[PDB]
Structure 1
Amino acid sequence: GAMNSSNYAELFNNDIKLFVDDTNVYRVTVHKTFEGNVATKAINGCIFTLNPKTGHLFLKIIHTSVWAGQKRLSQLAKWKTAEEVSALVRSLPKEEQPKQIIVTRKAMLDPLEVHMLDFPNIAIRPTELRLPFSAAMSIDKLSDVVMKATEPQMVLFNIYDDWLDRISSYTAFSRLTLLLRALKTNEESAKMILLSDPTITIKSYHLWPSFTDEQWITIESQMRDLILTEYGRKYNV
């Protein structure tokens, strides 16, 4: 059923699963019209579809042309998400298809369930976790490929870089979620933490900097401080 703290290690067992986050699919800027009314302008979006065990990220870029002439876009976005996730599963070899898909927002359940009717043995699950995947567009290379797209496009990444060579998938996911939680809570300070030292670079084929094990402990500690603080500066504690 629902995914929560009680069954959290299930993410890192050997049943293929994907998280689907739709929070960046339909993105707009709100602005004033010459007449003084308000209008939206859409910008490119993305579906964030992530294998938490392996780090494989299927980033389906949603180009603004998909919204042209359409009504009720926030509703359409959930069904567009489900259409693209279903298309992705059908494109995978059977032995690569997920046994479960976990949606980060419950409004994705019915759209995905309907699109996946042909896959009755794939479980569609919500979660009680408040995962910070919305912050994916704070990862510079992901933001860059989304904003530069001129057409629909799928781009594949490993969101863990090479971490699984040194750490388990439970630890890698924990680090990912801490980084993203920090970026969501205070993007500038989070990004300052990640890049303050010019000698630690991001490899061309990576998303995050090439930290040593020790430097990752310092970094993770600074992210927890940031998250703690902001929770004071927010709640005055």
Structure 2
Amino acid sequence: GAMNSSNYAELFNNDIKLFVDDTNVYRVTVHKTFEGNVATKAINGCIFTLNPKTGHLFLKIIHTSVWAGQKRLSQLAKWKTAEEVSALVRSLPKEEQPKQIIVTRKAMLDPLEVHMLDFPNIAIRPTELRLPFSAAMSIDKLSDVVMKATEPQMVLFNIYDDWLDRISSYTAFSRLTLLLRALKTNEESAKMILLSDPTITIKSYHLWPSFTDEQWITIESQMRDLILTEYGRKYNV
């Protein structure tokens, strides 16, 4: 059924799987109207579909036009996400289709399960983990491609850059979750940490900087410090 700390190494075995995160699919800014009422304006979003073993990210850009003339958008967003995931699966060769799809929010279980009825052997699962995928839009290159998009569009990334050349997927996923958690708790500070040293750059074909092994330790330490810092600032400890 659900996914928690007790079955954590399952993410990195050789059964193909994908996390789906729908947090950034329907995104709005709230503002006052001339009559002093409130109104929302939507902005591009994205579905965050990730293979945790390979780092392969299928970033589906959700262009605001998909909401035009629609009603009950937060509920439609779940079903649009499920449609898009089910289309992706179908677009993949059989040997590439997932055996399981873990949703990061339980509200996606029925929409996805109904869209995937043609795929009875693909298990749709929830998780007990608080994964920080909502901070994906704090990755500048991902934010940039979403906000410039003028039509629906699928862009592929490897969220781990070249890291699997030197470390395992377990460690790579941990590094990713730690970076995203930090971006989610203090974006400014997290980004400050990531780019303080102008001599470490982000390769054109990467998302994160080119840190040596030792520099990643330093970075990872500073992200931990920040997550504790902000926890100390939040709760006054």
Which TM-score applies when normalising by structure 2? 1.00
Deviations 1:58-88 (A, max 9, x none): 0000000000000000000000000000000
Q: 1:49, CA displacement in angstroms?
A: 0.1
Partner SS for 2:71: coil
2:72 alignment counterpart = 72
CA distance in 2, matches of 1:193, 1:158: 22
Q: 1:119, CA displacement in angstroms?
A: 0.1
Displaced runs of 4+ in structure 1, greater than 2 A?
none
Q: 1:174, CA displacement in angstroms?
A: 0.1
Q: 1:214, CA displacement in angstroms?
A: 0.2
CA distance in 2, matches of 1:27, 1:139: 16
CA distance in 1, matches of 2:225, 2:99: 37
Q: 1:170, CA displacement in angstroms?
A: 0.0
Partner SS for 1:154: strand
Partner SS for 1:131: coil
Deviations 1:184-230 (A, max 9, x none): 00000000000000000000000000000000000000000000110
2:215 alignment counterpart = 215
Q: 1:161, CA displacement in angstroms?
A: 0.1
CA distance in 2, matches of 1:96, 1:227: 36
CA distance in 2, matches of 1:232, 1:5: 25
Deviations 1:99-156 (A, max 9, x none): 0000000000000000000000000000000000000000000000000000000000
Partner SS for 2:57: strand
CA distance in 2, matches of 1:203, 1:12: 26
Q: 1:56, CA displacement in angstroms?
A: 0.1
Q: 1:39, CA displacement in angstroms?
A: 0.1
CA distance in 2, matches of 1:187, 1:8: 27
CA distance in 1, matches of 2:161, 2:49: 16
2:103 alignment counterpart = 103
CA distance in 2, matches of 1:104, 1:236: 30
Q: What root-mean-square deviation, in Å, do the aligned CA atoms of Structure 1 and Structure 2 show?
A: 0.2
Deviations 1:163-198 (A, max 9, x none): 000000000000000000000000000000000000
CA distance in 2, matches of 1:9, 1:194: 28
Partner SS for 1:177: helix
CA distance in 1, matches of 2:227, 2:178: 9
Partner SS for 2:81: helix
Partner SS for 1:8: helix
1:45 alignment counterpart = 45
Partner SS for 1:58: strand
CA distance in 2, matches of 1:29, 1:140: 19
Partner SS for 1:155: strand
Q: 1:91, CA displacement in angstroms?
A: 0.1
Structure 2: any 5+ residue segments left out of the alignment? none
CA distance in 2, matches of 1:155, 1:185: 26
Structure 1: any 5+ residue segments left out of the alignment? none
Q: 1:28, CA displacement in angstroms?
A: 0.2
Partner SS for 2:220: helix
Q: Map 1:1-237 onto structure 2 (within 5 A).
A: 1-237=1-237
